[PDB]
Amino acid sequence: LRVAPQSSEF
Amino acid sequence: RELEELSVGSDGVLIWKIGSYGRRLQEAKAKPNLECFSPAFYTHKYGYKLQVSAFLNGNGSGEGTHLSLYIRVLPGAFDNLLEWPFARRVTFSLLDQSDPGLAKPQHVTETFHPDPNWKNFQKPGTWSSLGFGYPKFISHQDIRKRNYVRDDAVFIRAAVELPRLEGLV
């Protein structure tokens, strides 16, 4: 589905 | 909940129990939006305020597939006394709940240098409340693979790496 994701690292 | 916080905050180490995992994961399937919030915790006495969120069913690139772990800076009573942006190194861990005497537990652990240019790692008051971390922390396949889930409960650890400043011996 959809998302306002928060930032990330691999 | 002011007691859950009092019991955590002080020395930069949160250990967070998330119970009713199976139920909570089933609701996160029904509401992809659904996130668990840890107690706020401080990196040191009169230090930064931090919070951890978990998406049991994943967020962003891990939605549907992974447990997703993020950490966030909150407005702290002591913000005007600290250096900005936040720059302490953060270490997420999901704990394998096997007796450490009877078997050296294999924990899943990741460390990251915060991103200086993230709107949230700068001082609250500047123009986002979002967070930072690992959308693909551990797989639904792998989460079941040991004692990461034991007694319908999971243990998330966030450690603010702040090393000791001593004189030479």
Which amino acid does the sequence have at B71? Answer: I
Instruction: Select the residue of B60, B132, B136 nearest A3 (Cβ to Cβ).
Output: B60
B22 domain-assigned:
yes
Query: Can you list the pairs that B36-40 forms with residues at least 24 positions away whose Cβ atoms lie under 8 Å?
Result: B38/B8, B38/B14, B38/B156, B38/B158, B39/B1, B39/B4, B39/B5, B39/B7, B39/B8, B39/B9, B39/B14, B40/B5, B40/B8, B40/B9, B40/B74
B108 domain-assigned:
yes
> Which helix (H) or strand (E) covers residue B74, if one does?
strand B66-74
CB B78 within 8 A of CB B43: no
Contact B135 A2 (CB under 8 A): no
B63 domain-assigned:
yes
Range of the domain at B33: 2-160
B112 domain-assigned:
yes
Q: CA distances (Å), B24 to each of A1, B12, B29, B56, B57, in order?
A: 18, 27, 9, 7, 9
DSSP-assigned states of every residue in B30-69: H-TT--EEPPPEESSTT--EEEEEEETT--GGGTTTEEEE
Distance of CA B29 to the CA centre of its chain: 21
B13 domain-assigned:
yes
B165 domain-assigned:
no
Which of B29, B31, B33 should we substitute to test contact with A (largest number of A Cβ atoms within 10 Å)?
B33
Distance CA B59, CA B69 (A): 9
For residue B142, give the CATH number of its domain. Answer: 2.60.210.10
B168 domain-assigned:
no
Per the structure, the count of domains in chain B is 1
Q: Does B133 touch chain A (CB under 8 A)?
A: yes
B53 CB neighbours in chain A (<8 A) are 6
B132 CB neighbours in chain A (<8 A) are 6-8
B166 domain-assigned:
no
A2 CB neighbours in chain B (<8 A) are 32
Distance CA B36, CA B102 (A): 31
Q: Which residues contact B131 (CB under 8 A, 6 or more apart)?
A: A6, A7, B53, B70, B71, B72, B120
Residue B49's nearest CA partner among B118, B124, B156 is B124
The data reach a resolution, in angstroms, of 2.6
